[PDB]
């Protein structure tokens, strides 16, 4: 019903060449392009096209950027080739999901991020200190709803499954990788918001969570405790960017790939159908990319020191 | 169009279309074309990483993360793949062949000034350059390049072998069929090969002025009676001014001529392969093409294609050939700056 885009934008790669004309129809020679202009070109073009698609579909959207490590399954390589074409690598990643996204960031980096990224930027703290929330995932017959719960566990919000229309993966040697996505939420049908508010999803007991959801109403496949701190920046031209810092610890898990505390930083915005007509999404995308690159460069040293993920070929 | 990148989904059967990613062939004028660059590398390196301390990944002790590759290694790997492919094709045929590394500059041309995008990735450029073959190689050198190449040969312990031998090259056309011919200096008919068929051409575009081109070419077998008749027959008379054709009665007309001062430095490489350094000072003499005129000095590597039975180390041979081509380019570079097209 709608096209979707997948991109693996590895940094420090320049797949393009400048076509420099030389005087003596036309004639030219090839020259080395800049280090990473092509990445920004692809990101901006795909963002603009998919945002146009959304606008013609009067669908809301969100530009979601998070920081973590993208670990490829060892089965991605064929015939044991260390070096492979980027186009082939992307077409291989798309076919069967060999990629594994791990949103994380070292604990000690928080002060450095606040002093050298949040404070120098227009980013200012908002909200009321730190808010504790429970993020849960309810699988159903044909859909996978998401639910937010307060300290008591009451149903704060019910949301439909995120649909990703554009999924980019900025990848860096030393620093944490950056995943950039454009997401949409098909409207929750109204009964569901009611259905899940009345029925107690979870039953708190001395800070221990036991599922009490009626089994016919899906299963609580995923559940986690979240400590959320919000920062916001409303720059000129009426575009807002939000830094959500989440200390997340899962409680009820389905698979053994998500079982540890994790610190996540997410840059988010909004692309309303009406606003996007008068909004240059080019600037929003470029600003998000630049901010992500700056923070990745800031935290690269401590990410390497604490996690040791240094991809050297 | 807009799908020139790996976006907008996964089109089915990508491995079939992208199996020959390192080059560009259109199955049934070189058949095989690849374009390289000294600072551009579409290749991405899949390294080995240790995600022992990640959250959620404490049992997996090995994972893969994509990173950038130095363009030297990516070009090495692409050239090795293309060379292995062309070697496989040659060995499938009975063709004997050779790989020549020539020096010069490559110039292209756009069909129409409109719809010309300033910055494109390599593969679409390769597609455009192989669609109608809109390119031209200009082999250039200087007199200082003579001393530079002499010093390079002395450093590489090259053998002197041939010195300043003079020969000629001519082409005879019957119907549209074309014959290449090599003649000895004293108007002696020497060798009657068929024109070179290049199965693989690589435009390795360096950053600086000197530019390297690797070409793998083979000769079809020559049918006996025509070549034998050509051997004894006098084809090229020489007046005191220049050469002239006396081959009319039983041959098609001559189209091209040339005089070659040839200087060959040969040596055995690290592996069991013999390589040559050919210095060719060519004077066009009689020509029919509007661009051939002008004396041209060329420096080339020439390596005969090793046979299948010899079973030479292909990877090491490719590494040595790339290293020697880079050495040639580096030696020629300091002398080659004044051209500026």
Numbering used by the authors:
A (entry chain A): 152 to 175, 185 to 473
B (entry chain B): 134 to 161, 171 to 483
Give passages from the manuscript.
Processive pan-editing of multiple editing blocks within a single transcript is dependent on the 20-subunit RNA editing substrate binding complex (RESC) that serves as a platform to orchestrate the interactions between pre-mRNA, guide RNAs (gRNAs), the catalytic RNA editing complex (RECC), and a set of RNA helicases. Here we report the cryo-EM structure of Trypanosoma brucei RESC1–RESC2, a central hub module of the RESC complex. Although the tertiary structures of both subunits closely resemble each other, only RESC2 selectively binds 5′-triphosphate-nucleosides, a defining characteristic of gRNAs.
In the model, the tertiary structures of both subunits resemble each other, with an RMSD of 1.159 Å. The inside of each barrel forms a tunnel that is accessible to solvent and possible ligands. The subunits dimerise through a domain-swapped β-harpin (two antiparallel β-sheets, β-2 and β-3, connected by a ca. 15 amino acid long loop). The RESC1 hairpin is more flexible, indicated by the lower map quality that did not allow model building for this loop. These differences in the domain swap configuration rationalise the preference for RESC1–RESC2 heterodimerisation rather than homodimerisation and the instability of the subunits when expressed alone.
